[PDB]
Amino acid sequence: LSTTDRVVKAVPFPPSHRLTAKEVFDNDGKPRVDILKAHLMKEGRLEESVALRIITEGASILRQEKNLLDIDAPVTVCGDIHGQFFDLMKLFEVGGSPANTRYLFLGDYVDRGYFSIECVLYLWALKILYPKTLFLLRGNHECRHLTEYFTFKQECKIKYSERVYDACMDAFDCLPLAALMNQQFLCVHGGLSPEINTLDDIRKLDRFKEPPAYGPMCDILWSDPPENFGNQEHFTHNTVRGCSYFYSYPAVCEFLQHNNLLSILRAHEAQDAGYRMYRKSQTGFPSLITIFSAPNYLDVYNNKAAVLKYENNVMNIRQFNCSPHPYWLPNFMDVFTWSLPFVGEKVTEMLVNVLN
C-alpha cells in the first residue's frame, strides 16, 4: 500500500482553503449560509478574521436584545445541543428551515460535544442572518468555569486560537436568559429562582459577565426540579448539582398564579423519552413540561432528543434520534502528545529487557 496517497479514497479529503470575506458575506454583509453550511459540513474552516467578524457581530446582536424577548407564536423551541453539530443539522431538518421557521434554543451548545466551535459559528451566522426568527438562550455550560473545566477551550486552541475562545466567551455573555412565547409561556434553561418575583427582576439583572459560582445568574442557569418532583419547603439544596436549588410543586403553583403563567419549560437533564410531564396543577393541564433536545447524551446515553413546535394553538412534540459524526480523540489531543508516552514506555521496556 502507498505510504503517501490516501488509503480510504471514498472519503473526500476536506478542503484546507480558508474562505475569505468576499466568499462568505455578500455585498450587504449577510452570511451566505448555504455555502457556509456545506463547508462546515465538510469540516472546512474560516479565515481567522472572518470567524472573529461573525462572532463579534453575533455578540453585538445578542447584546442589543432584551433579557426577556417578546416572541409571538408559531415557534420551535429546542433544548441542549452540547456540540452535536450534525444533530443540530438533524434538528433543523425536523423543525424546518430558518428561512420560514421561528426557533428558540435553550442553551448548552458547548461542553463535551466535539463540534462546539462549529455549532457556535453556524448558530451565530443564523442569528445574524435571521435576528428575529432564530433565538439562542444561555445555558449553565456557557461560562468560563465549565468551559475551562470541560473540553471547549482545547477545541478552540486546536481548531482556531485562544482568542477565538475569548470571543466566544464574550458572545456567550450576551446570550439572552429567557423567552416570552406568544405572551403565554416563559422559556428558560434551568428554571425558577428565589430572587425573581417579577419580570422586572429579570429585566434588571446585569448579564454581561461570566456567570458566578452562586447567586441569581447561577440558579437561573443551573437549577432543576427534584427527581421525585410531584411525588413542604419551597426551595431545597440541590444535592445533585452541588449548587442552586430544587423547587417544589407548591412553589411552581404559586409562581404560576402570581405571574399569570400557564407552564414552565426547561432542559439540562436527559430523559429516556426526551420529555417529562410532571404532576398537574390544581383543570387537567400539566403544571410543568420538560423538553430535552440533546440525543445520545455524552455519546453513551442512547437517548432520543425532542423539540416542541408551538403553532396554531397546538403544542406538537417532535422527537428525533442522534446522527453519526466524525471522531476526535478525547480533549482534542494530537497524535504526538497522545502517542509519545507510549512510544517512550515501550522502547524503554524493550531496551531494558534486551540489555538486562
Partner: protein, 155 residues
C-alpha cells in the same frame, strides 16, 4: 569503565549465538521475551546504520553510548527524534510518519482514523510549508513536557 567494557564483551559474546561477530535479527529473537515484542526489527534497523541487517560491535557501542548517565537532554531527545526518522534525513515526512504510527499502533486505530490524524498533525504542526516537521518545530512542541527525565538507563 573497566566493568562496563567487561559487561559489554560478555553480553556481545552471549548474544552472538553462531559466533559470527555480528548480531542478526534472528539472534535477538532467540531471546524469548523478544519473540513477542513487535518493535524489535525497527530498533535493530535503527542500530544498523550501514543497513546490512546486523549490529556490529561499533554500532553496538555507539548505540549504547547515547544512553549513558552523562548524556545531556539533547542527546536523548535526538535519539527519540531518530526513532521516527527511519530514512535519517532529519525530518519527519508524511510517508514515514504514517509508517511509524502504523508500526506502533497496530489495530488500536483504524486506517481511516490514523490517516486523518496524521494529516491533521502534519497540517497543524508544519510551519514552513515543506510538509515535514523540523527539529525546531519538534522542540517547540515537546520541549516543555520534561520527558527527558524518564529516558535514563544504568549501564
Amino acid at each position: 569503565d573497566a566493568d562496563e567494557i567487561k559487561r559489554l564483551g560478555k553480553r556481545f559474546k552471549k548474544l552472538d549465538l553462531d559466533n559470527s561477530g555480528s548480531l542478526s535479527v534472528e539472534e535477538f529473537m532467540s531471546l524469548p521475551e523478544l519473540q513477542q515484542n513487535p518493535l524489535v526489527q525497527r530498533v535493530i534497523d535503527i542500530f544498523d546504520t550501514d543497513g546490512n541487517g546486523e549490529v556490529d560491535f561499533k554500532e553496538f557501542i555507539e548505540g549504547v553510548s547515547q544512553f549513558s548517565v552523562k548524556g545531556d537532554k539533547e542527546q536523548k531527545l535526538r535519539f527519540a527524534f531518530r526513532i521516527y526518522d527511519m530514512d535519517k534525513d532529519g525530518y519527519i515526512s508524511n510517508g514515514e510518519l504514517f509508517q511509524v504510527l502504523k508500526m506502533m499502533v497496530g489495530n488500536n486505530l483504524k486506517d481511516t482514523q490514523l490517516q486523518q490524524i496524521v494529516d491533521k498533525t502534519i497540517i497543524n504542526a508544519d510551519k514552513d510549508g515543506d510538509g515535514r516537521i523540523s527539529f525546531e518545530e519538534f522542540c517547540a512542541v515537546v520541549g516543555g513536557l520534561d520527558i527527558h527525565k524518564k529516558m535514563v538507563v544504568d549501564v
